[PDB]
């Protein structure tokens, strides 16, 4: 994440680190982020699995705050490590343009939720698309600056602003490349944004009067990182409740949706 500071242990217990496991040397490399939905599913970005669709090219790390580049050493609790049992890229995903960039991963064996690992919430059917203004945060182990080979060993976080799509799409910004299933978040002057390695990660929001945060998007792409008028483009989770529910089950999704509590 370009900008923003490090996070504190337990601050975001649904963060999962998708890694690529080179078998010819047991090295693990963090390449994408992800969101813990339940004991056995993780929501992520589709593009992540490009040229990597074999369930054994991956390893999942939960309950982490500090992530090390290529490492072979096992992970000691509370950190957890897991294997991919399934990779479900969205049926109408479009590579390249990064459309319907959303995927689901089934874990094996399942993870135990504790002080450093628990689910995140998704929007309610009733939600509709993210209305600005609002206070959102993004987290991730990606680059700290456009390019710059090294990723962040310590999970980072940053506060960002939702931008209307009519603005995000205007000529002087993305000039048409944005669609209704997207969500743009960042700043007009940039400086703060996600970046490679953050992909698959969450865009969480809520209102000043509200208690809990909610994953309203998955980091998808953008033009560089932290550039003027080029906000990060995210996959709006709301329009995919639909698909999510058809893969993970109704109740499962129900359990990750806030009710109508006190305001």
């Amino acid at each position: 994440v370009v900008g923003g500071m490090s996070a504190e242990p337990g601050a975001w217990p649904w963060m999962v680190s998708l890694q690529i496991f080179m078998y010819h040397n047991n090295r693990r490399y963090h390449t994408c982020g992800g969101i813990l939905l339940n004991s056995h599913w993780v929501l992520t970005a589709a593009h992540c699995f490009k040229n990597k669709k074999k369930v054994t090219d991956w390893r999942l790390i939960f309950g982490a705050n500090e992530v090390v580049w290529g490492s072979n050493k096992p992970v000691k609790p509370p950190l957890q490590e897991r294997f991919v049992e399934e990779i479900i890229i969205h049926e109408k995903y479009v590579s390249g343009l990064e459309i319907n960039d959303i995927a689901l991963i089934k874990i094996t064996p399942p993870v135990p939720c504790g002080p450093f690992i628990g689910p995140g919430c998704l929007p309610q059917f009733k939600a509709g698309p993210p209305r600005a203004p609002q206070t959102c945060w993004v987290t991730g182990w990606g680059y700290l600056k456009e390019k710059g080979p090294r990723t962040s060993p310590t999970l980072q976080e940053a506060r960002v602003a939702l931008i209307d799509l009519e603005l995000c799409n205007s000529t002087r910004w993305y000039n048409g490349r944005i669609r209704s299933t997207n969500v743009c978040a960042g700043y007009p002057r940039g400086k703060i944004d996600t970046c490679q390695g953050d992909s698959g990660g969450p865009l969480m929001c809520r209102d000043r009067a509200e208690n809990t945060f909610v994953v309203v998007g998955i980091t998808s792409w953008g033009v560089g990182c932290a550039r003027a008028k080029r906000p990060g483009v995210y996959t709006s989770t709301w329009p995919y409740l639909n698909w999510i529910a058809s893969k993970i089950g109704s109740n499962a999704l129900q359990m990750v949706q806030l009710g109508t509590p006190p305001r």
Partner: peptide, 13 residues
């Protein structure tokens, strides 16, 4: 240590 329960819960610590 089920993963059910209220979501969006932070600092479970």
């Amino acid at each position: 240590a089920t993963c059910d329960g209220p979501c969006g819960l932070r600092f479970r610590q």
